[PDB]
Amino acid sequence: ISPAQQAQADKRARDAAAAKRKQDTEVSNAKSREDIQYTMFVSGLRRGRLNEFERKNRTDDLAILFDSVTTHTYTKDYNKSSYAVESKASDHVTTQDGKFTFSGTVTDSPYLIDPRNMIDRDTDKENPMLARRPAKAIEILELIADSHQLVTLVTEDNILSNYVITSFQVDRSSEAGSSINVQVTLEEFRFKRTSDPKKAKNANTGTKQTAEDGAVDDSAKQKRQTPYIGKNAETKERWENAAIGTTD
Amino acid sequence: QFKDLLLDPLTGDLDFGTPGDRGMRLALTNQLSLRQRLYLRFAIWAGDWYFDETFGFPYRTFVGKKTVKAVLDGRIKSEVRQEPDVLQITDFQSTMDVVSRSYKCFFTVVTAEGEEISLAFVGEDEYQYPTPPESNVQLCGDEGVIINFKNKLYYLINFRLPK
Amino acid sequence: RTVVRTFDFELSGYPDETFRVVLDSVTYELRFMWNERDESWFMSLGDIGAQRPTITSKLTCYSDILAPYRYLDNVPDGNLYLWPLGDIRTRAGRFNIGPLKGIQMTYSSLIE
Amino acid sequence: MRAMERTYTLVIGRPVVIGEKPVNIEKFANTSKGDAYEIKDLHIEFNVKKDNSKEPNKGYVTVYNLSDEVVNYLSVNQRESLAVMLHAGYNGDEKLIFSGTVEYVEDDFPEETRTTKFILGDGTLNLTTATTARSYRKGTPVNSVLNDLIADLKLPKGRVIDFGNQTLQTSMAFTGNASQNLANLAKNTGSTFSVQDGAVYWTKEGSRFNVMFEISEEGGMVGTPTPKQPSSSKKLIKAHDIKEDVGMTVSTLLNGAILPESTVYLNTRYHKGFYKVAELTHRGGYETGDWITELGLVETRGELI
Amino acid sequence: NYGLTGSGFNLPPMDDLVQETKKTFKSAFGEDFNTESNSVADKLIQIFNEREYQLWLLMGSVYYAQTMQGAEGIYLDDLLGKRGIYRLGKTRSTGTVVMTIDSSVPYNMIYSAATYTIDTDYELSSDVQVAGNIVAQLIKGTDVGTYRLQIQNTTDQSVKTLSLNLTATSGQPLITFFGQIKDFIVNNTILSNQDRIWIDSTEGALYIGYDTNKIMIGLSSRVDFRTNPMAGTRSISMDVRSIEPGYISRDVHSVRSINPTPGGFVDIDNLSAFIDGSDVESDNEYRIRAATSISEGKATRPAILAALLNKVEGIEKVRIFNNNTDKTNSLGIPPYRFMVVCYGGGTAEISQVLYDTIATSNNTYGDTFYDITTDQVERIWHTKAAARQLAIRVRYRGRPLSLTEETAIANGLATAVNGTMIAGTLYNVRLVGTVMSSTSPDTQVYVDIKNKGQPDSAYVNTDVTASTTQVLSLELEDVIFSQI
Amino acid sequence: ENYGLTGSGFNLPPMDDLVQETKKTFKSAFGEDFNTESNSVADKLIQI
Amino acid sequence: LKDVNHIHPLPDFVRGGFDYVPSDIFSGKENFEQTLRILLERLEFIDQKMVELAELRTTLNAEDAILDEIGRQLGIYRNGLNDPEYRAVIMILTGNNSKSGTRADIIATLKQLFGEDGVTTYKGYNYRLDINIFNTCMEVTDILPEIIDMLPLVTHLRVVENQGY
Questions:
Q1: Among the partner residues B117, B120, B127, nearest to C86 by beta-carbon distance
Q2: Contact assessment for residue D88 and residue D39, using Cβ atoms and an 8 Å cutoff
Q3: Cystine design at D220: which of C89, D79, D253, E316 (Cβ 3.0–4.6 Å)?
Q4: How many other C-beta atoms are found inside a 10 Å radius of the C-beta of residue E22?
Q5: What highest taxon heads this organism's lineage (chain G) (predicted)?
Q6: Are C26 and D26 an interchain contact pair (Cβ–Cβ within 8 Å)?
């Protein structure tokens, strides 16, 4: 070995570590703000669903439209006891979470570039292929799934809410070049501070200990006491030490 | 609302202020704070600041190499959204000149403004504690009760007579 | 009456917080209620699982809360005070209570 | 918009040393370096049972793929009792769920994944080594004997119900472990003694303490309550009458702000009323598994102490 | 449950009241009555209910208004009014400033109080005269001729004069002239002053009221001093107050300007932090002041003794005497008047401190007086002890002491300057102990003491006692040693 | 120069003085018209 | 910018609550409004009296019927005093507990009873002190006993009262 390599291993570690700080940071802030609401438009649009598509702005109610959706399926499940009941005892049944899946595609040669779509936030009007639209979609897709957003689906018949993404697939086969096939799967979510005191309810926090690195917690960790900034050291000083004392 | 030392947008040094009120200032408005937070984030080349190897922008990847305009714009537009208080990016005019080999982009960012939560650490107080009375006014009354009554009587005498 | 600082408190601002704390090796349960018109915190103190709180009082800065109540077997004998870290004129608020929020609610115990 | 995701924290501190004053596991959290070894984002499986009896409450924990430094710190101190605290909740707060000493620790690292194991005891060291030697004569007030023995045990007094003007009928002598002697006084006076999360609780059987907790579909209940006998055997009866003998069972999402000696109100569509608590079991699988708590309730027939 | 209980006053939430009143309505019209969402009765009852929440909150606020905690605003005054403490109103900042003046400004010129402003918010406290307020002086270089020197004695009131000739403008003659001036000044005022005046022979300049680093620190007190040829640059001390009451603060070296510049002005600066003004008193500091009132003692002999020692830029020693029986007593004192003796406390500044005296206690005896405005104006009296210097000779048997080794012994006898007025007894045994202490261990030692100027026959060993108004003193140069 | 070991002994500067010349030299680089009074942002930084 | 004392009548109490009518469904029907107004306006009276129950109990404004209760707690009985001066004695005695009888101090206490220029004090060599009154607003003989109490143990006092200079 030689120092020339030590100046090279550091580069290998530094650049690789920088990748997490980018990806890992973005998800953190994406979860630190609940105002944004994502929505997806699978079919539906031209049969009067435009009434609510126009409601979507470019800052809070982001909308996603795929260049084409081939199929989408919706299904629910139930189960019942397999043993004869004692007799009416109609409570021997349970409801499972409904599933939703669909297949789509994103192409380098779009036919409709409506700017309201969040995929086309800043896409060039005259050169769609240099905008690299398929890469734009994937970057959006991972962030939504990673942050665990409660997505809302607008479909042909009904509207579904509180659906989370559990898996998706992307591939670029030899056929259909210059495009990507996308599959998604979603399931229901049976979800159940600054608040109005009139809405407040008695809460609990269990047993609690010394809170945060304070003037007393510092002593426990052997940290040196934080010096006091001398904005005023004439009034409190005579009283602070006499009445509150010092950690010792 | 992130507080920090104010940086002069015109020179880059600390904003000590005008010659009439020279001193030191803190960045209070969210606009000013975000401006310098983006400025420092873009001005520091990646890896060049000790104590943090992951901070900065990797200019060395693009400068001096044959690069595609579209790839650069993505990275430029991505670093901006690392701040948690950025609402959106409005427009982006990326242009490249092949003769001079220069690249120059334009864009703007929109950010809201928040509240101050607490004024305890900044300057003033919002309360209006009362003022002690003066002299024997408390135990014997006040003359203003006479002055106000006299003024009311005078103004009422003024009102009735047409003018 | 020598006394030593031995505990500090923090409040999340929720108007009906309730939690259990241990002081002087004894355990107590505390309730904090926020008053809108009077913009002040109301503190109730009592034993664990007690039917009713033993003490109820209004929190204020530089006032000895427990002063008139050191004659009961279930009340701490220490000192409970609220004093500010910033400008001395700041009064207790909703979100400004904590080790670094502006107001330092603290408990100190006599040396025995 | 977010989801409702689990969170937890695990802390390891200095060795616990018993002295001449009540032991508080809180003050041992800080290590010689200051801040303690905190473990947050690693798949963890734990099981913590609690009860109101002589035996301490014990909880089990498992952690996968720990860093070598942390394991090294536990290879040392294998002769000593490290203090440990556990927290759990939902993405906005974490309630204390267990605190004690590391009774056991072992590591197995077959090929792909290491798996650390723990066994924790709630005050095991004090309850099993606190010796006593006391005596009293005829006429001594029983209320004095109780306080004398508890101070020997060297633990904070969570809650006690004094006997009043009761007096000993015969001379008494006590030796051996203090906990054992106190547990014997329980039988002959209808009182329940049990240490929990460092707190000593002395109450009276049959009676109960307000609605400190309410269970309903809004309160994250899981399934309907079902009646389950509170003991695995039946006693002969004259058919003290005040004693227990009945109970029920309920399950709920994890909530560490509950203790065996507390009182709960059951607001369901079939069952309604007040019950005591008798047993707790906390389970948890961070990446995969349940995040719930199970309560064993017992009916009460005494006065409202 | 939520009203008045055995442990104070509680607060009910909204939902409990809503449920209670809905239960009442249910009972009114049976279990079938609807009370949720769509009922007109629901819209009336819920709207009605929220108002009594305000009433309950206000009632709860009222109850604590009469308790040690919870009182606020006007109600707070009544609680602490029972203990005779009242809030402080608007206050005006107070402080003192100094300025250097050109050599040419005449002594008798008097600054008009109402024609100057220090800065945007400061003005002269009162009329100021240049004479009698000199605090520091600097003389350097350019000054042959005959010079007159004047000084008012700080103990007596007799003006003293000195005559000298500056035959040379540099060199040893100039050094000797400066030394003569130093000896002239030190013989009056206080010995502490000599520590703050010296000569920089390398530059041939004289510094008055400075430190070794050439920083004007001022003399021990304001004085009067003049030279017929007005040489060097003079400095004076002024008293300053703010224009309007309020909050304002200034640091130790903040003041830097005067708007109307007077002729001959040189510079201006601070010496110590001002007593900052304050706005209307707030509740927190009101409680703090109420808490710390224990130490507030006044109008008692221990209280007056303590106050003087902590309120004067000096006052090294103080003692009091009493005569209250129908007669003047041995010590010359009127029948019912106190006696206060001080050292190095000035006249005006100390006089103001004496307003802690018990009302109707005449006091007011001494050799010096001053008048203070209350309104009515009253005069107070006191005296300053007359220092008496001693001459000390040391004889011993042992190895000869080397030069610069006697410094420890000489400074060791500084304890001789710690004697108290009247009740000052040397206890030569104490001196023997001290001289044998401020040195390396190790045969014979003796101490002889006599008043300055007396012949060598006056040396004795018996202890000396201070007079009624005299206090012991000693100079480093007045120590001698002899080997035996 | 009057700080540290000096042969006659050891001299320690108090808290207050160190601020005084730090502000003085700091003021020298920007002139008198430079706020450094109590609670000012610049003063707060100097104290730390 | 804001008063610290939050105990005040709620501003515009009546129009509040009416603001909670959902979507003007009932507004302009003149049958539901009167029923609601009649009930709410009752709380107005109670809300108003909540203040006087606290305001009037302060010693500054307390009427004689209850001022006696305040004095009783402090041991200052009415005796033959009347309301206007009974208030004064209560203040004087209470204020005495933090006093030292200095010349500056004595002027301060007399300041609250005779305005700014209504009092002056001469001093004498042998414990003599004099009090002058110019603008008395109450009869002084009944107040006199207290005026002695806040003076040193050995004071020699004269009292002279007149109107004007």
A1: B120
A2: no
A3: D253
A4: 19
A5: Viruses
A6: no
